[PDB]
Coordinates of C-alpha atoms and ligand atoms in Angstrom, one line a residue:
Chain A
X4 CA -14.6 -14.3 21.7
X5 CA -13.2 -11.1 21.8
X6 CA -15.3 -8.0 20.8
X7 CA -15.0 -6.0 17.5
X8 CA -15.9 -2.9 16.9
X9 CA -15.6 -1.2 13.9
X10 CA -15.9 2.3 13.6
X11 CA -17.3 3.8 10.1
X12 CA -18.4 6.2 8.0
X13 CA -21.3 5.2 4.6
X14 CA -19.8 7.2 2.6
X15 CA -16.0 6.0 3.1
X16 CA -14.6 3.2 0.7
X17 CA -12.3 2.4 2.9
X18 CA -14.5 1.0 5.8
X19 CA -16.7 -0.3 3.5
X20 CA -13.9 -2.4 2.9
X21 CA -13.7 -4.3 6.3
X22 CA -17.6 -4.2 6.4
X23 CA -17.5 -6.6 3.8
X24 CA -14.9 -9.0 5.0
X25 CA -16.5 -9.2 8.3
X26 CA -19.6 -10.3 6.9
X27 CA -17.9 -12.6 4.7
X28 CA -15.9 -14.2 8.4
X29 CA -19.2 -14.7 9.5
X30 CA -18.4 -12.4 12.6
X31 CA -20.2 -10.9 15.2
X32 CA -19.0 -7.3 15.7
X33 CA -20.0 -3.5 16.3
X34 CA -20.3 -0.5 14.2
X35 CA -20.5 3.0 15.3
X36 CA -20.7 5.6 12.6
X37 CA -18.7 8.6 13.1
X38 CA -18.9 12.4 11.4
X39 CA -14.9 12.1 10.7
X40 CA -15.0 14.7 7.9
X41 CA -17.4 17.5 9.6
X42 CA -17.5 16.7 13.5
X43 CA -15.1 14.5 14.6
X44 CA -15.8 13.2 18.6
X45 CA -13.1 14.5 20.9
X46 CA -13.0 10.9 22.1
X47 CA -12.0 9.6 18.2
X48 CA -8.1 9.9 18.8
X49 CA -7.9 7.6 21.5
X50 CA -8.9 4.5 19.1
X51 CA -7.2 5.7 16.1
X52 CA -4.3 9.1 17.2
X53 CA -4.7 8.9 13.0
X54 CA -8.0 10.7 13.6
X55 CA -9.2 8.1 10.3
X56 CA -11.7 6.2 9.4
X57 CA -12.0 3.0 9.3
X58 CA -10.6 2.3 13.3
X59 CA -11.3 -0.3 14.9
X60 CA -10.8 -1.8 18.4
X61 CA -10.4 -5.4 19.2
X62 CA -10.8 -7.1 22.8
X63 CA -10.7 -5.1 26.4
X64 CA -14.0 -5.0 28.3
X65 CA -17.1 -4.5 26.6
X66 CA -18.2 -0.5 26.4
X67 CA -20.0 1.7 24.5
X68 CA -17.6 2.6 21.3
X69 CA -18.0 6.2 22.8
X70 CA -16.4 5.4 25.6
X71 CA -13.0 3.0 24.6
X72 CA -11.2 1.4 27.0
X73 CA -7.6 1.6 27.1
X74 CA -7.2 -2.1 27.5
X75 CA -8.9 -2.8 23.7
X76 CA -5.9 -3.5 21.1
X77 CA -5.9 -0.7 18.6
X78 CA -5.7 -1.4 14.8
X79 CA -5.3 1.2 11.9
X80 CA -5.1 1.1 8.1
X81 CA -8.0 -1.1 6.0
X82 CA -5.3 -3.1 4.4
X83 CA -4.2 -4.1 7.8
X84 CA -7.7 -5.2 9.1
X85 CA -8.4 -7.2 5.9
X86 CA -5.5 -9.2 6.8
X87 CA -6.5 -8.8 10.3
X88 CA -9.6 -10.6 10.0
X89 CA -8.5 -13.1 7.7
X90 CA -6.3 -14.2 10.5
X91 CA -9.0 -13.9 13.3
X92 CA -11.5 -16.3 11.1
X93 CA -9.2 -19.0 9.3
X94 CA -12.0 -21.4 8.9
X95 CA -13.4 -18.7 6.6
X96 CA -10.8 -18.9 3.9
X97 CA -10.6 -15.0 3.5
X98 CA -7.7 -15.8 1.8
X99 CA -6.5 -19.0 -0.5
X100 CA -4.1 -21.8 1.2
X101 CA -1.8 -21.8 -1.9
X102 CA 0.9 -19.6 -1.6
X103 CA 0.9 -18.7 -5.5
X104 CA -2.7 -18.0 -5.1
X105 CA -2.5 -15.8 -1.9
X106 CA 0.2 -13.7 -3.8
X107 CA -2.0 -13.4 -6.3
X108 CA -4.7 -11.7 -4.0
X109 CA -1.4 -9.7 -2.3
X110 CA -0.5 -8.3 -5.6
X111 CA -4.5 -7.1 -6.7
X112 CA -4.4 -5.6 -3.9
X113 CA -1.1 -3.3 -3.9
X114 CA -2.1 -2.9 -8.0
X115 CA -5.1 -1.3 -6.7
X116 CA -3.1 0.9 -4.2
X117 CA -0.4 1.9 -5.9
X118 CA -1.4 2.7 -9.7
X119 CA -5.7 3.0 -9.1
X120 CA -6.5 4.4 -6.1
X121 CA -4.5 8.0 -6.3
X122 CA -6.1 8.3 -9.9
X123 CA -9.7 8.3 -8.5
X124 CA -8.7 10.7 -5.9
X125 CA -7.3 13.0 -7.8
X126 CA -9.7 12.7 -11.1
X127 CA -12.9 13.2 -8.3
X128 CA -11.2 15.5 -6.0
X129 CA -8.7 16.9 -7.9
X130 CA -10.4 17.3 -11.7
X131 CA -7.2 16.0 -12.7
X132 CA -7.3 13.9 -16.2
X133 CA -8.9 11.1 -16.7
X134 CA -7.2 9.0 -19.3
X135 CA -4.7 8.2 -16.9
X136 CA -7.6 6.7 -14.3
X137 CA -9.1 4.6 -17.5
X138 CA -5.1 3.3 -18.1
X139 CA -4.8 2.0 -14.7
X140 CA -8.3 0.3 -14.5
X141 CA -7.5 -1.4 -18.2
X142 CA -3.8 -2.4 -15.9
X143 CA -6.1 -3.6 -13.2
X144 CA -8.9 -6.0 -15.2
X145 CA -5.6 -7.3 -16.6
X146 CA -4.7 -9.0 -13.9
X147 CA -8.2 -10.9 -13.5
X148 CA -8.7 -14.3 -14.5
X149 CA -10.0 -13.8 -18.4
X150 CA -12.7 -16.5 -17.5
X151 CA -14.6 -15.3 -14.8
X152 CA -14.2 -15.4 -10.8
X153 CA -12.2 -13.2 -8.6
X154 CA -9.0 -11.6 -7.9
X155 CA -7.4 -14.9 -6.9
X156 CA -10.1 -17.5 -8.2
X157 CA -12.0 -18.0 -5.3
X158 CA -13.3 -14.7 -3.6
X159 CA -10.7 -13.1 -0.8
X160 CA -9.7 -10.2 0.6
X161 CA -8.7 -8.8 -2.2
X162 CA -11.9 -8.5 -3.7
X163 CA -13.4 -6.7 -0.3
X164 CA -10.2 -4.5 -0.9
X165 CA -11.3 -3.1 -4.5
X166 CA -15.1 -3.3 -5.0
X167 CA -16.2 -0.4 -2.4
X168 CA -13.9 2.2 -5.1
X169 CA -15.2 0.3 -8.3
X170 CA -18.9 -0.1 -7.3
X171 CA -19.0 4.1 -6.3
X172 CA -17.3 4.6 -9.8
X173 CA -20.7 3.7 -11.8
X174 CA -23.4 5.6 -9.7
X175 CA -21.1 8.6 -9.1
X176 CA -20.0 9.1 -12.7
X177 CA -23.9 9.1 -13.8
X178 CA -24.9 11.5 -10.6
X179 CA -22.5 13.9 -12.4
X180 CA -20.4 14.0 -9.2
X181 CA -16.6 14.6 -8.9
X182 CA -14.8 18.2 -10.3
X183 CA -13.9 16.4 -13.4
X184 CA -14.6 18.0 -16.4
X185 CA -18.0 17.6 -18.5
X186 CA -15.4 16.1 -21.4
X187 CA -14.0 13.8 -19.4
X188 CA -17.5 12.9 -17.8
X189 CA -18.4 11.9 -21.0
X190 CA -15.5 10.0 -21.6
X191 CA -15.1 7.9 -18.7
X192 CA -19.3 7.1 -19.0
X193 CA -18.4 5.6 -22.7
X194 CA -15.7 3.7 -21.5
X195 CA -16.8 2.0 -18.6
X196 CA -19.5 1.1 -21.4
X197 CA -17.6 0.0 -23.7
X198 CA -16.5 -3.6 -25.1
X199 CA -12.6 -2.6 -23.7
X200 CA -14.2 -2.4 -19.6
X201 CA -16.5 -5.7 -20.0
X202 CA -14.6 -8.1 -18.0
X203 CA -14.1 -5.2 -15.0
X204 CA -18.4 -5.0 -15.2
X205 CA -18.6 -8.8 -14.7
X206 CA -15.9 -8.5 -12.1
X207 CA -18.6 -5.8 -10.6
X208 CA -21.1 -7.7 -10.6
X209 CA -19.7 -11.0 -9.1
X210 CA -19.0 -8.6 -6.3
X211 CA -22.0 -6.6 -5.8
X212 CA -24.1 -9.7 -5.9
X213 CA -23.1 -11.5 -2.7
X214 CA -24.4 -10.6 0.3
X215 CA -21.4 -9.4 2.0
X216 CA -22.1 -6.3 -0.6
X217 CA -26.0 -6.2 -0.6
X218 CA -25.7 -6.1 3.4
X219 CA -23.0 -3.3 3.4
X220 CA -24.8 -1.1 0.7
X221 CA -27.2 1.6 1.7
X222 CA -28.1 1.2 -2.0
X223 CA -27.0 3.7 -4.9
X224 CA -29.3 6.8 -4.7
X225 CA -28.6 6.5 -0.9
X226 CA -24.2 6.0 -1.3
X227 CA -24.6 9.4 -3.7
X228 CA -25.9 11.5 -1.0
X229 CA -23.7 10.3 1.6
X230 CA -21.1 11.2 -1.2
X231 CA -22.5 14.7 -1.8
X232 CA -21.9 15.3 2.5
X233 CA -17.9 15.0 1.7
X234 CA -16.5 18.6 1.8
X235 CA -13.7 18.2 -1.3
X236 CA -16.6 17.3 -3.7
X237 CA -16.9 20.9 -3.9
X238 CA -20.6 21.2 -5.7
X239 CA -20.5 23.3 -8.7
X240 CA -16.7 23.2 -9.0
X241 CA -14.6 21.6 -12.4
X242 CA -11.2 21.4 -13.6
X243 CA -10.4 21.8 -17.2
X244 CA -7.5 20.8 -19.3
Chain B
X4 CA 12.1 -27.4 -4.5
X5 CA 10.6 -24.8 -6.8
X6 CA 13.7 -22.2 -7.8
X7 CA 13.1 -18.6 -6.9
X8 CA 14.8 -15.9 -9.0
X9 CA 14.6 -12.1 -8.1
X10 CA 15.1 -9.1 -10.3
X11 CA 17.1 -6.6 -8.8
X12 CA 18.9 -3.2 -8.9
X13 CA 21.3 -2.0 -6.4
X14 CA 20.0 1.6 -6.2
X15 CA 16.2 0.2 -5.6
X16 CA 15.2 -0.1 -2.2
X17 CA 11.9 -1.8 -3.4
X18 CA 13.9 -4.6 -4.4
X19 CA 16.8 -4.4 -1.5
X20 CA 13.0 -5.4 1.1
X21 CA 12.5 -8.8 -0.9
X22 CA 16.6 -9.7 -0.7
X23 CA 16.5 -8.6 3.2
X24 CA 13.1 -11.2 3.2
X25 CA 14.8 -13.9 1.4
X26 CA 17.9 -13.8 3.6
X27 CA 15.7 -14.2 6.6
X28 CA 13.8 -17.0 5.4
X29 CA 17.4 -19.0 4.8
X30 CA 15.7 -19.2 1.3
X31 CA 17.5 -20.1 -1.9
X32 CA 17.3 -17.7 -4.9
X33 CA 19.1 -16.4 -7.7
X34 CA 19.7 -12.5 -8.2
X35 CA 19.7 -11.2 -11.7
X36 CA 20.5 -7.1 -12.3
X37 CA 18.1 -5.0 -14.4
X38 CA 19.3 -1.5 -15.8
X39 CA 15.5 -0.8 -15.6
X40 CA 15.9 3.0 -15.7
X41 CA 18.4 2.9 -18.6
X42 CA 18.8 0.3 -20.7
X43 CA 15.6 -2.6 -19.9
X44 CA 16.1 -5.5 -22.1
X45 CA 13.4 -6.5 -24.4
X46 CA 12.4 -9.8 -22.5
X47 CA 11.7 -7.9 -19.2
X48 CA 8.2 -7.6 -19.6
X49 CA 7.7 -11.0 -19.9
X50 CA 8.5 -11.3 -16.5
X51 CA 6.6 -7.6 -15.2
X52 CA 4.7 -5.8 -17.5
X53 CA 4.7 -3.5 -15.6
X54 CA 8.5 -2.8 -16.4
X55 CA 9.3 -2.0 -12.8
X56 CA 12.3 -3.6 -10.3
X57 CA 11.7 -5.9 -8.4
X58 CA 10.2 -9.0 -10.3
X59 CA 9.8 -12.9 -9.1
X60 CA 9.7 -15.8 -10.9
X61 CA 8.5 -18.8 -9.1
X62 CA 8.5 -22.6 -9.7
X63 CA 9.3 -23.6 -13.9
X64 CA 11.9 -25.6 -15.7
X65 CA 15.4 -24.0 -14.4
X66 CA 16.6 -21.5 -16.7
X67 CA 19.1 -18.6 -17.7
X68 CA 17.4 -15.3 -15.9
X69 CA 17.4 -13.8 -19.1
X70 CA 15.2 -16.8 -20.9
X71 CA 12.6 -16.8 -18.3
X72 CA 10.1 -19.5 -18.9
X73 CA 6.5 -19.0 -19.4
X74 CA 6.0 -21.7 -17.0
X75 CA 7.0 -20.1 -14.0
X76 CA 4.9 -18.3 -11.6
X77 CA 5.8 -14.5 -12.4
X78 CA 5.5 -12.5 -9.1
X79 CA 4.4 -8.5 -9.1
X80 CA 4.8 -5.7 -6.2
X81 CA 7.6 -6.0 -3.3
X82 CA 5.1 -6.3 -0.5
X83 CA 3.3 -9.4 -2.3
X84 CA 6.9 -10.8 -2.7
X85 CA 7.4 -10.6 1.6
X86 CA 3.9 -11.9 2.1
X87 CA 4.9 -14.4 -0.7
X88 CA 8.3 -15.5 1.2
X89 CA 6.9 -15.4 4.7
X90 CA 4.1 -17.9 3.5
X91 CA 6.6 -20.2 1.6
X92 CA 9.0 -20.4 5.4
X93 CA 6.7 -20.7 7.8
X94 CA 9.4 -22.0 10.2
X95 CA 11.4 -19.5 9.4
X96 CA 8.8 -17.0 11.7
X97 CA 9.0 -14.0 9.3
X98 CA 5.6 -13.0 10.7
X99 CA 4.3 -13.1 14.5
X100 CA 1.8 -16.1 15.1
X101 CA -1.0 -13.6 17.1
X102 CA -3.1 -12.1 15.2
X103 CA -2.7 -8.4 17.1
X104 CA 1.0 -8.4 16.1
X105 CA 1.0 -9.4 12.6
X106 CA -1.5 -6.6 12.5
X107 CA 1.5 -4.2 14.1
X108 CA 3.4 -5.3 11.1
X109 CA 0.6 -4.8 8.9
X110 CA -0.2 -1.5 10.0
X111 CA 3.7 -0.4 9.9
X112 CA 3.9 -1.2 6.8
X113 CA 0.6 0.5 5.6
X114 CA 1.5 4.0 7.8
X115 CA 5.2 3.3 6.0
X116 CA 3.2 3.1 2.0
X117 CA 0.4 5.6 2.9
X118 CA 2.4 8.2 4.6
X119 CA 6.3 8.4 4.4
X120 CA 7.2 6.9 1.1
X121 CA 5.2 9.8 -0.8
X122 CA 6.7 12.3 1.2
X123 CA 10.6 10.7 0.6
X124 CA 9.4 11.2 -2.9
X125 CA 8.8 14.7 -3.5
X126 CA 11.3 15.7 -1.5
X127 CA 14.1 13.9 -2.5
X128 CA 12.9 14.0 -6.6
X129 CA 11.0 17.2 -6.3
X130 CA 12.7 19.4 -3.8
X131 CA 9.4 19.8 -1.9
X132 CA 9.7 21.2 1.8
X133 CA 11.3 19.0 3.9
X134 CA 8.8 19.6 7.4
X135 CA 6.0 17.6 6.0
X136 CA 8.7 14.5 5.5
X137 CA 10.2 15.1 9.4
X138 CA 6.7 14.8 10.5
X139 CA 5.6 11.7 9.1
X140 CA 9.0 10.4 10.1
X141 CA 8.1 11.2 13.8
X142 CA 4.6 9.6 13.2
X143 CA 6.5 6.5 12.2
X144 CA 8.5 6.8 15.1
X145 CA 5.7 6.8 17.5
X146 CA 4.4 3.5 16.0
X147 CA 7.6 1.6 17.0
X148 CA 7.6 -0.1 20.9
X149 CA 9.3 2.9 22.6
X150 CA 11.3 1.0 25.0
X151 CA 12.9 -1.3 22.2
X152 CA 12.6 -3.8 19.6
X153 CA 11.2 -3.6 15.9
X154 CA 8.2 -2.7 14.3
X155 CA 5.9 -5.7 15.9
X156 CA 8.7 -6.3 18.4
X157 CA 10.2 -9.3 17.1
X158 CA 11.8 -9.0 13.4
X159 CA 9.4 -9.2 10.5
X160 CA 8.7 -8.9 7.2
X161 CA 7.7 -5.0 8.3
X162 CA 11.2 -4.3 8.6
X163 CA 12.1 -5.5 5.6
X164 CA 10.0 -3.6 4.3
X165 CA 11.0 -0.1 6.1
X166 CA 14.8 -0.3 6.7
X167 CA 16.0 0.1 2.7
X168 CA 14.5 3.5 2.9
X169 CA 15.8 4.8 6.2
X170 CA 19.2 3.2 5.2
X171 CA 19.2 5.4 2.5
X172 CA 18.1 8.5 4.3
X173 CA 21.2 9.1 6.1
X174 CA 24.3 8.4 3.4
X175 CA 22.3 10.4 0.7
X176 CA 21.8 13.6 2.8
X177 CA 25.5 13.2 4.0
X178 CA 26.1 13.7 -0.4
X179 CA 23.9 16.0 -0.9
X180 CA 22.2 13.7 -3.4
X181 CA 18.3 14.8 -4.0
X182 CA 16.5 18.1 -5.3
X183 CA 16.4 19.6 -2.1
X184 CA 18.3 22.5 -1.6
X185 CA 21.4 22.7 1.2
X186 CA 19.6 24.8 3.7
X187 CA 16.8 21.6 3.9
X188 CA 19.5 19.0 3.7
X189 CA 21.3 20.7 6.4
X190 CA 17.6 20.8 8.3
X191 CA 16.9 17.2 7.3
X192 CA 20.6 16.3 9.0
X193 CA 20.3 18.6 12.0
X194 CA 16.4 16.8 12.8
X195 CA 17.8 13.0 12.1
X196 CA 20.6 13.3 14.8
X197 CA 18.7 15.3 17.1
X198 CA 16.9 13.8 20.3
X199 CA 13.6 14.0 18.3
X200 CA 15.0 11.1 16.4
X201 CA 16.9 9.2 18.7
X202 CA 14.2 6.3 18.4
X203 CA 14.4 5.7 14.6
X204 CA 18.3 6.1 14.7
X205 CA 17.8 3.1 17.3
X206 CA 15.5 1.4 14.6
X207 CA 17.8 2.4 11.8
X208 CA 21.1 0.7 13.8
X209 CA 19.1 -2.6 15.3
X210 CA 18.1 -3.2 11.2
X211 CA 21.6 -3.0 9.6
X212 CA 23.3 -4.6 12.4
X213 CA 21.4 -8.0 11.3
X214 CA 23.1 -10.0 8.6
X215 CA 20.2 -9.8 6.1
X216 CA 21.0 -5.9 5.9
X217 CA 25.0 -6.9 5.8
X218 CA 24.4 -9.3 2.9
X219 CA 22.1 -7.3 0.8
X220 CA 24.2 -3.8 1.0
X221 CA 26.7 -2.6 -1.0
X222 CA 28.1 -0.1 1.9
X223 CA 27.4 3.1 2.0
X224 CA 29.3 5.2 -1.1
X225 CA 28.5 2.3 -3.3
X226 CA 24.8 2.4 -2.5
X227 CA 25.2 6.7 -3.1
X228 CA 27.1 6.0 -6.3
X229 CA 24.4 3.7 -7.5
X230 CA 21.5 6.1 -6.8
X231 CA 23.4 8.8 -8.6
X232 CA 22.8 6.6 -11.5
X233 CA 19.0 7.0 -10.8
X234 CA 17.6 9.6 -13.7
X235 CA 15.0 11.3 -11.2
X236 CA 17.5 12.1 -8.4
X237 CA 19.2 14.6 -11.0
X238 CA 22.4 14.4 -9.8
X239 CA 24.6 17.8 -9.2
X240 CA 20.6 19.6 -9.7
X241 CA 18.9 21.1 -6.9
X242 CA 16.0 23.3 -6.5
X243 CA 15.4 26.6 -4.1
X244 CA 12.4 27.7 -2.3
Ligands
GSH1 N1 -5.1 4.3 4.3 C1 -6.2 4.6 5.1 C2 -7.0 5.7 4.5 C3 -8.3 6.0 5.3 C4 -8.9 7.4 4.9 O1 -8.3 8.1 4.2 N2 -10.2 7.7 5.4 C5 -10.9 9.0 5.2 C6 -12.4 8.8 5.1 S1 -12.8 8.0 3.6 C7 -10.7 9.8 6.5 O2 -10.9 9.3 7.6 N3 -10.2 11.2 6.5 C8 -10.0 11.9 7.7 C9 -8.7 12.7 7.6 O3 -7.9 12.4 6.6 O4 -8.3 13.5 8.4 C10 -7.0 3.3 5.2 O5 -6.7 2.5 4.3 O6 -7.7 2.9 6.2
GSH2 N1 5.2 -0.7 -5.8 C1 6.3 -1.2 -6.5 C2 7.3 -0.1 -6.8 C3 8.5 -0.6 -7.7 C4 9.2 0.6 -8.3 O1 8.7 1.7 -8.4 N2 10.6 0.3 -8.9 C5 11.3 1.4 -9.6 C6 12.8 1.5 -9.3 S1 13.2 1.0 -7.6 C7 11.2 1.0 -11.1 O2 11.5 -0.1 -11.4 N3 10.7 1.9 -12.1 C8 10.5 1.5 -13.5 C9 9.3 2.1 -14.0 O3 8.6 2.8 -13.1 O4 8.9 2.1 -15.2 C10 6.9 -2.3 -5.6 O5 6.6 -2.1 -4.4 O6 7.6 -3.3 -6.0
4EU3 O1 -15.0 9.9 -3.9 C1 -14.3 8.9 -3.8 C2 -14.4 7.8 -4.9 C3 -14.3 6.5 -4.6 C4 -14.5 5.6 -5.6 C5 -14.7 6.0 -6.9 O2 -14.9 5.1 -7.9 C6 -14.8 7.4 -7.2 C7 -14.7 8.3 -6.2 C8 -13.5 8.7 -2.6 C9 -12.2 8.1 -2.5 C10 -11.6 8.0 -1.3 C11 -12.2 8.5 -0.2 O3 -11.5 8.4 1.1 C12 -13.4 9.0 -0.2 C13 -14.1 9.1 -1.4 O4 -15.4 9.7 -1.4
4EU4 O1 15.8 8.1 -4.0 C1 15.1 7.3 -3.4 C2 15.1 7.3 -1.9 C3 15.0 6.2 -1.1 C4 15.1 6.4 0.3 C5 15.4 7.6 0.8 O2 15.5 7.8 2.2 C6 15.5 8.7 0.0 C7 15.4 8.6 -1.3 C8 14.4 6.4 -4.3 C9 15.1 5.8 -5.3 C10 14.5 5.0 -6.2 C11 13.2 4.7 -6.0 O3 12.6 3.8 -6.9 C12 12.4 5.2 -5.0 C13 13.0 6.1 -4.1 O4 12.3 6.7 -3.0
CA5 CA1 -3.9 -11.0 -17.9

């Protein structure tokens, strides 16, 4: 019964994240979008002191997300919420029963965190190389099940975790955006193409095709421009090596 | 029933959470030493492939550590292990029941992964400034109940996952051991006994006075003269300005 509100940002991965596993809990919650990276509201510290998006506040009286309460329980970090809301929604099986198979999810998910998601900041942000990025992906789609189906068999958390940073990775590369070099443009483009990346494009797809994705998309053309707002993608800035 | 066995190093602190986890649960488990940074025996990756300390098997025929069986569950990633252990004892409480708190725990152990471990890193292997690691510290700090307790105020798998690195903190800097020069070791020591600190040394005592810290620690100049051990931390090397 308690209210959720979530506060967001299109462009951001990381609340897309928690977008998507609300929708999958079936909940009934609040965004408000906030301008974290070129106008942040004076306000924003008092639901996350982080000053990061996603926040999000559960419980407390109901009010306007521009005016928190104090009473509403503050949560940070999108890895935290995931698991948040899992536990909020049981009888939505965010996550398996089987103990084996929830590690499973656990371990996709800290794969992602700890080897993948610092090579696609630093290859878009940074320029920085890009065989390293294509390594850890190869690592990731490793740890899928060869036949099909998700991180741990049946879609969970973990798959909300990872698809907001994979599904960006094919409309970004083809918009030319990131301060990559051309070379390694080119490169990443033919891999991602290639017979070594199909299972990671079914995985994709699986993803992109439930509605918990279609209902948290603003659609390609329209996730690029949010994209292009973010300061660090420089425009007309690459790094060579 | 199913046999657990853990892969382990003394120097690792990865590997020290999922023994602190284990001795909470009241679990049964084998230990087996890996000279992962020197001298990995060939079979290793059949248990990670990822080569890294520590590594899980789960369930299979019972077997010599070194002839794991391709029948056992192989466990990746030490926060997926204290997920892992806190779902297989669920009497033994290693997570709150309310949702809000295990999200405390979650979110410590995200601000802990996101924030402080990177910054341990380059100091300690890179002999980066130490002011960016004192204030992630103090954010840490902040998140703990400032009147008392641990990270979600009862124990939980979020100080399991915490206390093998601030453990570590103080005994290393008290032996110089790290890339940082004197002057920020001196800084480092000065900050961590200041009043600044006082909270986390609170934190740092309530941890290693519980007997899962006791059981799974060396003492202090064993643990230094296992990290000197450690390649990276370069020992008798140091770097200025
Ligand atoms: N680990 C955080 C990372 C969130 C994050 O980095 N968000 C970006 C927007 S995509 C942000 O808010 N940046 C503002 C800042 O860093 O000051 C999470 O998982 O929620
Ligand atoms: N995210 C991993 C980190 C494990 C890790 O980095 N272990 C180090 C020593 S404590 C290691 O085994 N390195 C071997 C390697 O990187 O190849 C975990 O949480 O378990
Ligand atoms: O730009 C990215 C990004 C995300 C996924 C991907 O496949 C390629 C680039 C990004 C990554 C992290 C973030 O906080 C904001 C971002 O815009
Ligand atoms: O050297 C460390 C370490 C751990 C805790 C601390 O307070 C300072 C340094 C270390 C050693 C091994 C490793 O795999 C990771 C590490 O950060
Ligand atoms: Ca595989």
């Amino acid at each position: 019964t308690k209210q959720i509100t979530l506060y967001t940002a299109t462009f951001s991965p990381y609340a897309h994240r928690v977008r998507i596993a609300l929708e999958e809990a079936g909940a009934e919650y609040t965004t408000y979008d906030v301008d974290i990276l070129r106008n942040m509201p004076d306000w924003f510290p008092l639901v996350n002191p982080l000053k990061k998006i996603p926040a999000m506040t559960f419980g407390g009286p109901e009010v306007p997300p521009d005016q928190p309460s104090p009473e509403s329980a503050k949560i940070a970090e999108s890895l935290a919420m995931l698991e948040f809301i899992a536990d909020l929604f049981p009888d939505a099986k965010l996550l398996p029963t089987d103990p084996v198979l929830r590690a499973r999810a656990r371990t996709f998910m800290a794969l992602y965190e700890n080897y993948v998601n610092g090579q696609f900041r630093d290859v878009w942000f940074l320029g920085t190389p890009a065989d390293p990025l294509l390594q850890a992906l190869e690592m990731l789609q490793g740890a899928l099940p060869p036949d099909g189906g998700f991180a741990a068999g049946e879609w969970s958390i973990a798959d909300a975790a990872v698809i907001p940073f994979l599904a960006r990775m094919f409309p970004y590369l083809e918009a030319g955006l990131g301060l990559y070099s051309k070379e390694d443009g080119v490169k990443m483009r033919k891999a991602m193409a290639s017979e070594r990346f199909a299972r990671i494009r079914q995985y994709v797809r699986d993803c992109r095709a439930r509605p918990s994705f279609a209902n948290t998309w603003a659609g390609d053309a329209e996730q690029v421009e949010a994209a292009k707002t973010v300061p660090m993608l420089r425009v007309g800035e690459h790094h060579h090596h």
